[PDB]
Amino acid sequence: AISDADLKYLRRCVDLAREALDDGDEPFGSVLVDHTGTTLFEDRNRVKDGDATAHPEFAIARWAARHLTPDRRARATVYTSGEHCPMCAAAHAWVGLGRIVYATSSAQLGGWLTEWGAQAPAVATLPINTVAPGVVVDGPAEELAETMHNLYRAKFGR
Amino acid sequence: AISDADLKYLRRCVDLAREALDDGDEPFGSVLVDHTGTTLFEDRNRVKDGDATAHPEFAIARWAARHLTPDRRARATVYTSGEHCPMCAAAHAWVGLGRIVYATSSAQLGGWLTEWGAQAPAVATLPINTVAPGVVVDGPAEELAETMHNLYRAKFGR
Ligand SMILES: [Zn+2]
Ligand SMILES: [Zn+2]
After folding, report:
1. Ordered alpha helix ranges (H), A2-144
2. In CATH, what number is assigned to the domain containing residue B68?
3. Do B65 and A52 count as a contact with CB atoms less than 8 A apart?
4. A20, A155, B37, B48: least CB-packed within 10 angstroms?
5. Orientation angle between helical segments A106-115 and A145-156, nearest 10 degrees
C-alpha cells in the first residue's frame, strides 16, 4: 500500500526527525499533504522545552482544524516517521483528517525499546486503529526500518 | 475510592460542564488540584469555535507542563465530569500528572449516545488505563450518574 510517491514523503518525515534530533528534540517528523499533492504543513517534535505533548501530528491536527474545511481534511494525507501515539491518533480522528502513512509502527518502536533495555513510554503503544477505528492506515515502510532503528537508538537506546 | 472531598471537586466539574452547555459548548468540565488541596486551574469544553480537540483535560495537561515542575505534576490530581478520551488520557500521562477521578465513565456516555441514536464517535471509548497503564484512576461516582445523564441528554439527546 506504500507507493513511490508515499515513500518520498516518508523520507521527508525522516529528514524532519533528524532535524529534531540535531536540535535536541526527539526524532519524530510529520507532513500534511492535500489531495492535489501539495504539502500544506510540516513539523517535528519539540518536547525539549518541557512539554512532552509537543508532537508534530498533534500540531497538524490543530492546524488542519483551523485552516481546512472538513472536506479538505478528509481528503488530506498525514505522513509520519513514526506511527501516531494515542494522543495524536485521537486528535487526528477528532478533527476528521484522512489517511495516515507511517514509516515505522509503534510495534517496531516498542520492540526496539525492550531490546535496548529502555523504559516503556508512559503511554501504551496502541495501533492507530485501536484508537481511531475508521482511519485508513498504511505502513510501515521496509526501506526505512534500518534508518529509524538507528535514529531511535541514538535518542532512546543509550 | 471516592472521598467526600473528591465529590466536592467532581460537583465543581459538573458546574463547569453546565457552564459549557449554557455557552453552546459540550458538557465536559475538569479541575486540576495541587497535592496541598489548592485548585490550580479549571476548564471546560470549548469546541464550538470549530476545534473538536478543545477538551479541558488536554488544556490542563498543557497548563501543567507550562506552569508546574514534574514533582508538582506527579502529586496533582485531575477531576473530570467525563472520563478522559484517549487524546486526553495520553496527554495526562505524557506530562506525568497524577491521579484521575471521574464522575461518569466513557462507557456510560457511549451507552447513552447509542440509546439516542447519535453519531458514534470517531475515537474509541477506551478506558484510561488502556491508554495510560500507570495512571491511578478512580470513578465513576454513582451519586452523580443521573445528573450527568441529564446534562448529556441536554446536548446529545434526540
Ligand atoms: Zn503523539
Ligand atoms: Zn479528551
Report:
1. 4-22, 56-67, 70-75, 86-95, 106-115, 128-131
2. 3.40.140.10
3. yes
4. B37
5. 50
Q: Which ligand is nearest to the CA of B89?
A: 2
- State residue B43 phi and psi, 5-degree precision: -155, 170
Is the CB of B94 less than 8 angstroms away from the CB of A53?
yes
Domain extent for B34: 4-156
Type of residue found at A26: E
Count of domains observed in chain B: 1
CA of B55 to the centre of ligand 2 (A): 5
Q: Report every protein residue that has its C-beta within 5 angstroms of ion ligand 1.
A: A 55, 85, 87-88
Cell numbers found for residue A129: 486503529
Listed in sequence order, the residues at least 6 apart from A103 whose beta carbon sits closer than 8 Å to its beta carbon are: A10, A13, A14, A80, A81, A82, A139, A140, A141, A144, A148
Tell me which chain A residues have a C-beta less than 8 angstroms from the C-beta of B96.
52, 122
* A52 close to B (CB below 8 A): yes
Q: B111: how many CB neighbours lie within 10 A of its CB?
A: 11
Nearest to B139 by CA among B124, B148, B53: B148
| Cα gap B28→B45, rounded to integer Å | 5
B chain contacts of residue A89, beta-carbon cutoff 8 Å:
86
| Experimental technique of record | X-ray
117-136 of B, contacting A, C-beta below 8 A = 122-124, 126, 130-134
**A 59-88 residues inside an 8 A Cβ radius of B:** 61-62, 65-66, 85-87
Angle between helices A86-95 and A56-67 (to 10 degrees): 10
Is A32:A64 a contact under the CB 8 Å cutoff? yes
Distance (Å) of CA A13 to CA A29, A56, B41, B44: 5, 10, 36, 35
Phi-psi region of A52 (alpha: psi -120 to 50; beta: other; left: phi over 0): alpha
Please report residues of A whose CB lies closer than 8 A to that of B125. Answer: none
DSSP H or E stretch at residue B109: helix B106-115
